[PDB]
Every structure is written in C-alpha cells, then in structure tokens.
C-alpha cells in the first residue's frame, strides 16, 4: 500500500556528475565514456566557440581535473572531449521523450548531486522543476532494466518559475532558445491520460468514492476536456489504459465519466490518493510499475 | 525557482543493498563493512508471526541457513546474533561500496529519503516523515521489508529508518538501525493500530515561509497570536502542538522573510478557518507537513523574491 511520486534509484547518473568552468561561468556536465556533455551557454555560439582553446575549460571529477583534448559543438550542446574514460559509464542511450511522459531529475550544484526528484515535461514543453543558480546541466532519466536513457538536460528557467532544456542532442523542448530575451511558457494543460491512470491507481489503493454507473462516449468526453483546459484523450490513450481498465473492471470510458464528473463537481471537501487537485504526473506505465515492484 | 519533495541523491546506499533468505522467507539486507543488519522476522513463518519467540527460533539456526546475496555473488556468513528487533549477520567479506555512515534514532516530524526494494534490487526512491502517531506513509509492497530510510549531510550518510512491517490501514511500521520500533508497535501479526494522526505545525509552518520565499503572500494578515491561543485553535484541527522550541527552530526563517513566527501562527490560523478559495500555496491545495525547517532552507534560495 501507499502511493508516492518515485524517482528512479540515481546511483547510475551520481557516477557520471562533473563540474565544467569556463571563465567565470560554473555548471553541470555529464561524463559518458571520454565526453563531457553540457550547455553550449557556459561559454553566435559559433563565433565564441572559434575563440576557445582545450585549456580554457576546467573539467572537474571529484577531487580530479580532467585534461581536455577537443571540443566540438551539437545544437545547444557542447561536447568536450577528455584525456580519461569514465570507469563509471553505465548502460546508456540518448532519447527524446514526448509530453506528458515523466521522468527523474538529479539536481546538481558545482559537480556534486543535491537531491532527486521526479517530474512530467508538461504540454506546453516546460518542466515544473526546483532549480537554482548553478543547477544547468542537470539531467533528467528514466531507467529500463539496467539501461539508463538520459532524456533532459537542464538550460534556464524562465519568468514564471518553470524550467527549459534540452534533449541530450542539444535540441530544446518547446519553442525556446538559449539566451537572455523575452521568453514565456505558452498556457499550460492538463495531462488526460495522466490523472486517468491516477484514478485507476486509486481505485487499486481501495478509493473508490467517485464511480458512477455511467459511461460517456469519447467525442463527449474531449468536448467536456477542451472546456476544462485538458490535453484530448486519443484511442491511443484509451489503449493505453486497457491493462489498469481490465485490473480494476472499470472501463477507461467508464472512468472518463468519473472525471466528467469530478471536472463539474469538484471533489466536495473529500481526496483522492491524499490529494484535493487531480494529479496528472504519473503516466499509466509508472502507475502499473508502482503497484507490480519492478527493480532495477 | 519551485518547490518539489526533493529526496537525497540514493547511490551511497544502492551499493549497501542486498537480499537475505532464510528458509521460504526473502527480505532486503543492509550490508555495511562485514555485517549485514536485516528485520529479525526474516526467521519467522507466517504462522510464527501471531506469538513468536525469537530467541527460541534463533537458537535452533546455524550460519549456513542464511543465504546472503549482494548482486551475483552469495555472501559468507561466519556469525550471527540479535539486537532489539533487528538481526546482524556477520558476513566473511567487508562491503567496498561503504559510505561515511552513523545510526541516528529521529523524532516525529523529521523528514527522510526511502530506496524501496525487492530481492536486495532497489526499485525507486522518494521522501517522506516520521508522523507524530510514529508511522510512515509510504509505498510499499510483500518483499520491501529491510527497505531503509536514510538522510545525507556533507557525505555522511545518517540511517535512520528499517521497515518492517504495514499496519492495517496501509500506513508503514518499522525501526531504528538498532532494532528498536517507533511507536508502540511489535513485529508481531497482532491486532495493533496506528494511533489518531496529526498535522506536523512547526512543518506547515517552514513551508508557509518556503512559500512567502518563493513570492506568495496572499495567505498573511494583519494580526498576531499568543502562542497559548495559537494552540487552542490549531487542536481543534488536530495540529500537534507548537512548542517554544519550534518557534525558537522557526528563527532564521523569520529573520530572512521578516514576518515573525506568531504573525505566520496567525496566518496559519486563518488558513485552517477558511480554506483555500479555489487558491493553492506552491502547486498545492492542502496544507503541506513533510517539509521541515531545515530543508527548507536547504532546497530554497537564500534570497527572497
Ligand atoms: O497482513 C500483512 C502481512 N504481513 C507480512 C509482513 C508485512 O507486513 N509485510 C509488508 C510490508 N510492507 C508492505 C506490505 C504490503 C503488502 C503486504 C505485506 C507488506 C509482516 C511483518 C511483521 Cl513485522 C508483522 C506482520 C506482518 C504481516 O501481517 N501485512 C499487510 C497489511 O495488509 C497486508
Ligand atoms: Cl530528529
């Protein structure tokens, strides 16, 4: 029983932390193999990068300075090239998630890890995340097995307090550059298939206070969702939600009409899971591995 | 910028876990230098758990029938013996992995991260606190017994929780590293319930100034409280009670945000009287209590927007 927002064990990525400083700039880079990966900003990208020797930045593992070798550039990324492999490279792979997917963050201060915490990349491409001044180049991962793919790595936060980055090619998510200008989060939604998988969660934590005998159809349910500020919920979603629909004998029509409901009612001074708002940070995957107990 | 429930980074204690078996029984171990410390009921049968005797079922095992595995490899156990709740095997090889540690006993209302684990594999991490009723809520499932609760200052890292067992509400029981529960609970399969829970004030309140940190102010009066008064209200909502020491622990927060702690008690007070209005304080709609002072000032910048 009980039911908490889980990171993934970080023990893979701590390994992989470094600082890298570039004149009076400090921040996070990641050590894989014999490149340190961080953002292009610690240093026209192009025409500041032609101005840079190996010897200009400072690469540090722990206790140790890493010799830099080359330096190259990837989108918003730069790629620094060390004398040493790192012993500690785990299994890895370089992936871009899609919104409404969640992930964990190590959040990083001058090389050396603070905390983890788990997070969704919202609709609108931003990450409601706990940064301060020195957390850029902080990562975001998910684990399978014993793989790690490295998802996000962290570049500014914007007015509003929410945070922007990129994938770990350098392209950014959402519409955003890398730079000191007028920048804003578009108007944020609600993650559908998310707080639908939260539901079936609670349902299986015995909270069963907010079914109702009624279905509705799918074309019923977005007109009800586009009104509410909530992402439209696909067949894709409904299939999806069909191994938690067949767990709990509730069909994900039948549960669509228990959020209707909730959306028009509100939760009249009652909870659900411990919460008075509808989460939406916990995908139906994270909601099935939660309640099975899959290791790592 | 924001406010998360942020947990210690895991990978110091990930390199302690392992699975110990005995008999039909797996549970997760905690293997730091040569010993590896684990709930004593992992020599138990469900049936053994209504009255058990441990000592008696102890007596009867010798080194060899406990199986002690740290990844691929099996562990040997050259000892045994049983200190309060908790059973420490002596194992023939010291741990590389061992971090900088100490056993700390913590009270209720402290905070901490929780490597939940199966089979000596570490499955998630996150952070949660000691109720004042002596439980944890947290998430867990058959197997996560030996699953430890742990906190990381400097490079030290402070064990402070062992678990053991779920109560029948779904709440989470379990002890010190020394075997000794928290609260009035036995590793028995007998009719015990959590006492009546309550909201951790002093908690509520290092978050309230978390949020007046990070720019929300909307929740403030004009008015102040005795701290008996104070109290007398904050009962009848059951908040613990707030003590001397906690506006005195309350200090530097006050000091770095300028609205003293009685001026914040009545904030809180006014808070509890007419809910939210639809407002939320830091992306919440309830009061917030697994956040202590501390970390507060540990996660929130140091200036105030
Ligand atoms: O009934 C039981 C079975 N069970 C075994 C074990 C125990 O509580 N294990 C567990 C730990 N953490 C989370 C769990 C989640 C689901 C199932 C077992 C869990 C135990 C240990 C001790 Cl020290 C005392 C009593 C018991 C005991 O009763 N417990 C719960 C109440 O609902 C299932
Ligand atoms: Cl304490």
New interface residues.
Partial sequence: ????????????V??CMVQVTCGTTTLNGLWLDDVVYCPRHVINYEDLLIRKSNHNFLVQAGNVQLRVIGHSMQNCVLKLKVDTANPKTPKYKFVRIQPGQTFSV??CYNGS?????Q?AMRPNFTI?????NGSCGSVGFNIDYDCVSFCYMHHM?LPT???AGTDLEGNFYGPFVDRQTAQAAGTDTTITVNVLAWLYAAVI??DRWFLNRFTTTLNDFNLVAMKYNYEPLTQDHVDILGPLSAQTGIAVLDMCASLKELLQNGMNGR?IL????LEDEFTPFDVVR???????
Avoid: D, I, W
Avoid at 113 to 117: D, I, K, L
Avoid at 290 to 296: D, M, N
């Fill in positions: 029983s009980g039911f908490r927002k889980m990171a993934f064990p970080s023990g893979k701590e390994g190590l959040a890890p603070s905390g983890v915490y997070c409601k995340g706990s940064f301060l936060e307090g929410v945070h934590n015995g909870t411990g919460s008075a708002l939660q309640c099975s107990g899959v290791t790592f």
